[PDB]
Amino acid sequence: NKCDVVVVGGGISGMAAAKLLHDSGLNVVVLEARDRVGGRTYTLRNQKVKYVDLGGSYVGPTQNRILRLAKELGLETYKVNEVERLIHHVKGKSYPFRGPFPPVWNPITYLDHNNFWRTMDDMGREIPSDAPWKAPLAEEWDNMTMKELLDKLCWTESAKQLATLFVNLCVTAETHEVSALWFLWYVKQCGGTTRIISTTNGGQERKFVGGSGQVSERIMDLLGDRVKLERPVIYIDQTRENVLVETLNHEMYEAKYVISAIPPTLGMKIHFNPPLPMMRNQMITRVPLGSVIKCIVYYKEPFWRKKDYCGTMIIDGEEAPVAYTLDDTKPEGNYAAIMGFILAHKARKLARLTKEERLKKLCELYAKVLGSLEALEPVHYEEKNWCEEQYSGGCYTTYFPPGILTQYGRVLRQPVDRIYFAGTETATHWSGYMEGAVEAGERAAREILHAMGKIPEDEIWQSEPESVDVPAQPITTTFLERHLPSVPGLLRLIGLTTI
Amino acid sequence: NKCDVVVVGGGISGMAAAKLLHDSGLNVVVLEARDRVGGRTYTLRNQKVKYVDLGGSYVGPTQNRILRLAKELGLETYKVNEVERLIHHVKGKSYPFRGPFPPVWNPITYLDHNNFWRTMDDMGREIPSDAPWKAPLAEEWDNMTMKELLDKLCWTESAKQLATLFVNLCVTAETHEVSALWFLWYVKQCGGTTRIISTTNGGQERKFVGGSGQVSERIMDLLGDRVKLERPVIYIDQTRENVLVETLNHEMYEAKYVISAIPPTLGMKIHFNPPLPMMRNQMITRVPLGSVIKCIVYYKEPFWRKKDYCGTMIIDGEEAPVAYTLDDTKPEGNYAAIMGFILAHKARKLARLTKEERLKKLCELYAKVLGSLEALEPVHYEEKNWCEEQYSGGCYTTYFPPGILTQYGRVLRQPVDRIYFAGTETATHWSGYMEGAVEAGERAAREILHAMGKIPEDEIWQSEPESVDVPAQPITTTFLERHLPSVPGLLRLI
């Protein structure tokens, strides 16, 4: 019934918001649609796997907010295995390598690859993290798909294929589905290409011992009965002095303010009185989430290590169901496992199969890529298709099709009377991630504290001290990386000399 | 409480479905979110306008279902005024013309324009009306925006600006927002470019005397208390023997079957048990509706007619708030008016202004295009911004961004257990229009009749006899239109 703030959604973002408010002495309620907290994080426990993250899992350097929250809750991280060699599998063959990017020998191809990544980051620097629509060429970039941009930029099929995989993997959508402006923003606000793709020194460096779902679960423990499970919100009424929030199971909640901590499009599941303003009304119909199945195949031993493979596979090819894998073995060295993502159109295509059929296709792929018959001997399998989730809409996050971020992006976190907007989608640093969920939940909560006259305006946005447990090495480039010509640049040099 | 079929939504499609089922002897209930019926149609009545369509309004030849339904309800049409010359306003000057297409004089530009329209219809011939995802090049065409297609096809800025205006007006969206496959399908399923753009012998030939809102209002009259207003549906439970449908005002309905006659994305406003299957679950987040404000400026007389202008204006350029107008004067010749559409990004931009600020911009525009100071003296103004409607999502209809139709298009009308799908978006002929709303509503109703064993499978989809009142003339092309080369074609020959 009566409280200071109702938070809609008990994922990391809503729970971080509720905790902050609770810690500040306010009376909060969390209204969660599902029979569990965690949302796009979900840690399955059974005897075969012990624990496994079937949703968000990875954390890394520069993600200081999630690291701080988890440490305060008594959680610890461990490093994802990247001791041995990575594999780039292309045109039916495997090429082992070290470092975050697959090496390229052909000098033309080398230049094209170098220019592709460099240009991603060059364009990114033009895009304000907190206002991507303010980029000087926001409109021109927003009116193009990533596919169109890759077609202009990549002078080799090799670079174009790798760039395509990079997009599909970062945002679980096809290159023709997404805005170039939005994608360039998304990479930049994670710190750029190197930080986003890297295991060591990037986003995939670590996982939480015991699973990421513990973040949301432990906050729930702190909040006690203030968290209401199986209360999907259906109705928000702001016509009266206090805000009225109604649930599907016919409960009514009365609040001074509301935090919406749900994916933006899932706002459509709530009926608003008075109606939302036009821009938000239309925005929430324009912002789909991507498509992914996260699959974990268990083995007797981490046999790939014995062949000096760390477990990371970057797999290019339409026939490959999985484009990317990581070693998911426990830090103790047991429950040997490979985690793989089935991405974008393949999530759609392969969802038609049975679980046993998907396991078979994955094992046969892994056996080929690792050149290892032992890959055909799994001991266990778990998977989760996030496309089927009514209360998520997809994973990992929301993508913006061409034309949408410039027209509608400014209203993403704009308050609507006494409703404030959290959720990873509204973050300005690691939006799409557990990090962004914490940033947005805490910012939303402080927006309310400000409105109540409890903190000054300048305290709404707060910086985060760097983690001492997970230090960040700076992203650096070599002189050659900076100044090597692109393929057309080299061609210009050739035409000029012989003139 | 209990009935045979619950129809969710009281727009034309929901109403047509309910009437068909009711007429066949089933007990139907229509659950309508708003305090009115008609949905994306809405006829306002006041003394200043008598009546005005602020939503869907136009009907024309080959739209036989809406015409038959309206005729049965006692409605009549009248012809939109196209007696005098049309105007194409380009680079700040007005060029009057006759016929559906504005003439082009530069011979190179002429070839480019001719090629564009012809190419739209050529491509459409390979897209099945009932399955666009089966086009031989479905994926290639779906993976490109209309912007990319126009960039490839249009060698002149002249053709490209007109093509862009065409896209904007047809689907109230930007060329870069929409799939080329989906847009080409949309045009082809209205009968092609000439049929879609034409007033005389096309989709804008006619309006209903007294307003199109009468169609839904008169069906509501027929159904009596079977229509429940202010009953937004929030919850559909299919786990039990009977389907349970819950409304926002706490009421429960029980039925054998359900028809969803709301825009696809507005399915998101309903919590489903069991959850929807994966493809529909994601589909309904991928399918926005366009952006439009419909604006009608009233004058003492239809003064443009005195200058041999019919009131149709095609207006190029970024600065113009409205790119297209039609004469909205009553058939009696009174309530003189010009209807215009503020489209796509301009709807978003200009929504920030006041009603009076929009009136001033339109009037000054019309004064310039019509070359008349009389345009600066409006007697009255009505407008409707459809972007603000919680229970429409936009107007005129749902558009598909790149990649969506091939991936999710199959699920649009696929039944979910005992829920069947109506709504103009599910139609296969004039989808997006009131005609499509009738086609889909009746088809969905007949799918349920068939599921009940009352009619055979071959009666689910039914042809419509041609209207005697609004007969269609054939679409023709000339020898030169068919065989003149494109710009690159003229270059190959050089």
Swiss-Prot record, chain B:
It is a single-pass type IV membrane protein. The modification S-8alpha-FAD cysteine is found at residue 395. It is found in: Mitochondrion outer membrane. The keyword Electron transport does not apply. The modification N6-acetyllysine is found at residue 50. Residues 1-487 are cytoplasmic. InterPro entries: Amino_oxidase (IPR002937), FAD/NAD-bd_sf (IPR036188), Flavin_amine_oxidase (IPR001613), Flavin_MAO (IPR050703). The record marks 154, 363, 380 as: Important for catalytic activity. Changing residue 387 to A: Complete loss of activity. Its EC number is 1.4.3.21, 1.4.3.4. One of its GO terms (cellular component) is mitochondrion. Inhibited by deprenyl. Its cofactor is FAD. The keyword Oxidoreductase applies. Keywords: Acetylation, FAD, Flavoprotein, Membrane, Mitochondrion, Mitochondrion outer membrane, Oxidoreductase, Transmembrane, Transmembrane helix. GO terms for biological process: dopamine catabolic process; hydrogen peroxide biosynthetic process; substantia nigra development. Its main location: mitochondrion. Belongs to the flavin monoamine oxidase family. This is Amine oxidase [flavin-containing] B. It comes from Homo sapiens.
